[PDB]
Amino acid sequence: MAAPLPEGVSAEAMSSALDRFARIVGADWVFTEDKITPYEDPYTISNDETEHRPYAAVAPASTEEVQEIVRVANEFGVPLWPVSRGKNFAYGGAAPVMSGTVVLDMNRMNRILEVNEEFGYALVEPGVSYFELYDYIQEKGLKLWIDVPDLGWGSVVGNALDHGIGYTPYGDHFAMQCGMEVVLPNGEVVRTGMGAMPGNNTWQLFKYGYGPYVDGIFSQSNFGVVTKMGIWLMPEPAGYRPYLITFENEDDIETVTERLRPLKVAGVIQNGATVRSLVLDAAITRTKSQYYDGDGPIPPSVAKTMMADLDLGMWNFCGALYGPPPVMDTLWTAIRDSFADIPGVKFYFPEDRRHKVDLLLHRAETMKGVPKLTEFNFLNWDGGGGHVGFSPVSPITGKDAIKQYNMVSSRVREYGFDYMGLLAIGWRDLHHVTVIVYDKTDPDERKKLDELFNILVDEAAAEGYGEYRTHIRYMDRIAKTYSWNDNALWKMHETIKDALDPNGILAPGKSGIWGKNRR
Amino acid sequence: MAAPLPEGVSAEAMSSALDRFARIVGADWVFTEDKITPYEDPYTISNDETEHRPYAAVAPASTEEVQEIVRVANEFGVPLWPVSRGKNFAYGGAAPVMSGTVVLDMNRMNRILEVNEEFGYALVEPGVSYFELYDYIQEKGLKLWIDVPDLGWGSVVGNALDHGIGYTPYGDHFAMQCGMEVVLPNGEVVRTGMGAMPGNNTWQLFKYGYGPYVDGIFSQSNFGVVTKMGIWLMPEPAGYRPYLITFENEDDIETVTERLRPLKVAGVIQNGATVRSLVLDAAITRTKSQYYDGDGPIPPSVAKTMMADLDLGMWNFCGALYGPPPVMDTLWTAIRDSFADIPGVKFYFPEDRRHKVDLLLHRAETMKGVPKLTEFNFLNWDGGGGHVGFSPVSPITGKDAIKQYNMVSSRVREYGFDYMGLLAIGWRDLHHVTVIVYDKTDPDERKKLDELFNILVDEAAAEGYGEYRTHIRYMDRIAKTYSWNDNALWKMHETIKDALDPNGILAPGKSGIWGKNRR
Ligand SMILES: *Cc1cc2c(cc1C)nc1c(=O)[nH]c(=O)nc-1n2C[C@H](O)[C@H](O)[C@H](O)COP(=O)(O)OP(=O)(O)OC[C@H]1O[C@@H](n2cnc3c(N)ncnc32)[C@H](O)[C@@H]1O
Ligand SMILES: *Cc1cc2c(cc1C)nc1c(=O)[nH]c(=O)nc-1n2C[C@H](O)[C@H](O)[C@H](O)COP(=O)(O)OP(=O)(O)OC[C@H]1O[C@@H](n2cnc3c(N)ncnc32)[C@H](O)[C@@H]1O
Ligand SMILES: C=CCc1ccc(O)c(OC)c1
Ligand SMILES: C=CCc1ccc(O)c(OC)c1
């Protein structure tokens, strides 16, 4: 039941590390036994209780405390798993790849250092939630919008660092980053970009500074602990019009994707708009048992009944227009005209929706940066479960979108799960995120889910498709798919890992990076 | 006369390396003795003939040749200076920081691998010029625009890697980079992003791939040799209207900058528009001798004559509108109304310019990505010179812009040069590039220029202002300005440098990064 020590670390070295942590942060902020529960992955996959088990957690309240924790980790060989808020649900929560790792929980580092209206940026510590930043802005009356993922309880910092996405024009969270403070694995502190200039007034204004542009190496990484991050924020626009376009046929995603490509590449679709499958959208407001008594995935009659009941299609394109009315009118003509000849297509603004509790009314808040927790509802689809994200990247091409749709949905449904797919529209790509809802308390369901997930990764890789982000359980497996020139890129990451973190004390296994002591 | 050997490298070691280079590339493509002259800085600053002298150059035609050159460099400890085209004029040309370095000239690697109209991207080798990419697009009738710096003979790759800028909405060249192939300092080759996925179709569509985001560490860097690079390209817009707004008073730049800020942060100003001083703009079509017979910088009465003769201001704001006419009309109303109340303001479209050879008619081409060589015209201003760029970063704030103007123009004029100032508007910053035109053939003028440059650096840094880019001569001095926490950031760069390049054979001194054998 209890976590094992990490390999190569004695009870004495662990015990000396945890006493030193308690001196740095205070005894109230070192969590070791009954108190480790929140750091376990909430959505279990393994049936092996020795896997992904944190030994303890430590909750610092300053950069100095993070530095001291990292120095102690080096002294005793005790590996850390840094998290900003640790809400990485469906990718492991706050749990580490390697059992015995100590979570470094930066929740209590929740200072909003600055929100600047005139330049549209925030400078935040890692414990700052989307709810907290949003509330600060509303309280101060600042004419800025934030960009939120579906769950507002996450970290502005942590989500961006994991290459997270939201649903406004600022939906590429890491792309909006500007300036960061990093505790390097030796416990030294650096500031990137203009933050390296003493007395600067440009840390959050100009990304590069001078010399190598290194901010990105601390994203999806174990090269450092990020303790402050700047992020650009969108000025409140002069107008906002959310829309939903629904498609009748699963096979419409091919032509729909062809039509989205020129609109997104030219920026006529201004936001990280989405195309969401029926069940993902139905599960926000309904449960399977309201339409079907069976244990399988839904049959076609059930899909069609849900579509007619909820005014949803098999595919649901949710986007928004932003700016002065004459600009929004022009963009709407180009978007509407692109879809208007597909048989079965329907166009909605919010005023056109029948239900008070409705997909479009919900996503209208998301696409103006309003944090919420409504998306958690899809976990009740089959009575209450966990989820995991299978998140391959696609070109914005109909051939690829319908290929991935067919490959993923056929397998998910074969293993007894409904298909719940998001196509998140990036600058030149789709993130295809399949959320697989399963009973995480049931060892037989966990076994099927694990087998299915390995199949989806292998079949996607055999088609030249890689994941952008993954669960702690599969980080090695995904690294091994990026194998060009005999794993050349991971050999370079391991070179950088050994130089910055020779003792391998930061997040062993994050993104399949281990360091020389554990390779 | 001849370059010295690099310190620590024997005549035998150099001779053995150069013979091995000739076996790799062919004896015709190793340049020594008289064939070295194009690799010298054309715009000399030092009065010491032993400084910034390349020993030789080698001109490979494939990534494989680049890899074998790098392996031989490691074997003999012979340092390389990689350039894509080596047209870095005003920052050293192709010349190295450290005398005795061999230039690794990638001009002959000039394949356009792909230009993709429907996804708006190109994949290019380092030798591809902006002319070549532009001409390929026009010949194939592809509906794409490129983004050019003022000089079209530079490298799409090399300019981006040095954080170069241009004048369309795609003006931040490095920001539009997607996917690269790098020869690491050990001679191994890696592909970043989705390039690491065998059989991918997403290298130029999704920046990150999976894991640490490293593309940035190879910009303004000596961490590797970039051999292929993707870049996003703008779809040809539905319309295009370039404009010039002129201001009568040198002090107008304070209020003008205050008004530019909200327009830029909200994206109403769609491109990397520019505010250029009178002399920089006058010098595109006139010489000082046509207005003034005096020895040094122009007096106020001569400025007023020039302004009325050319329809220029003390400050000239050159931008463009892009997209459908209703969009261009809406953005123009916001831009025009922001400046309308400034005494002495004048607004011009191309049809309003009375000169046939004119600043606006020239920059109208630049702001739709037409490569040209007309910007060298300003070098005629005082009878023929070279130039160096003093390039501090500023907030988009009136107070900062007028402070930098006063600091820089005072000192430049005091040392006998005219002030020629560009404020290139980025997303949240101004790049303030002062081009100092000087008689590069005169040791007394080079001594004044060198002393002036040192003063501009030290005075800017005393005000918390750092340069985004600099000349080879000043790379150490600029690195030493980014000194926060006892030079913490450069200690990290040196850690990564020693891990990737233990022999220190890539570009010692680039961005003030030397490697353990030479610091
Ligand atoms: C189940 C689920 C998940 C989900 C979602 C909807 C549901 C129902 N909607 C999402 C969305 O729309 N967009 C998105 O990007 N993610 C979405 N998710 C996934 C996930 O829940 C969220 O992304 C969530 O916000 C992530 O958690 P949080 O924001 O708390 O981030 P974290 O756990 O602290 O950090 C993630 C990992 O990054 C590394 N890390 C984080 N902080 C640091 C610092 N400061 N230094 C170094 N590394 C850091 C760690 O590897 C950490 O595990
Ligand atoms: C005098 C002048 C300069 C100038 C300009 C106008 C005038 C009159 N206008 C500019 C503009 O509008 N925008 C801009 O960014 N620069 C402008 N300049 C400056 C300069 O001349 C140009 O930027 C020019 O394009 C740069 O030269 P080029 O494009 O040929 O680039 P390079 O010399 O090959 O590379 C520059 C440095 O980067 C590193 N490097 C380059 N390639 C590699 C590869 N493949 N791998 C690793 N490092 C690389 C080197 O340090 C190289 O010296
Ligand atoms: C409804 C799903 C939203 C979602 C978006 C992006 C993600 O990476 C993700 O991971 C589990 C979930
Ligand atoms: C006319 C000046 C254009 C210009 C722009 C950016 C640069 O860095 C530059 O360097 C000298 C020159």
Author numbering:
A (entry chain B), B (entry chain A): 1 to 519
What does the paper say about this structure?
These flavoproteins share a conserved FAD-binding domain and a more variable substrate-binding domain that enables interactions with a range of substrates. A fundamental distinction is that the oxidases efficiently react with oxygen producing hydrogen peroxide whereas the dehydrogenases hardly react with oxygen and typically employ other proteins, such as cytochrome c, as acceptors.
We first prepared and studied the P151L mutant, intended to mimic the N5 environment typical of the oxidases. The result was clear-cut: P151L-VAD can use dioxygen as an effective substrate for flavin re-oxidation. Therefore, P151L-VAD can be regarded as a competent oxidase. P151L is even more rapidly reduced with a kred value of 339 s-1, which is 600-fold faster than in the wild-type enzyme. Interestingly, we also found that the P151L enzyme binds the substrate with 40-fold lower affinity than the wild type. In general, the oxidase-active variants (P151L, P151G, P151I, P151V) all adopt the trans conformation that slightly shifts the amino acid at position 151 away from the flavin. The analysis revealed a consistent pattern: in the oxidase mutants, the 150-153 loop conformations create tunnels that lead to the flavin re side.
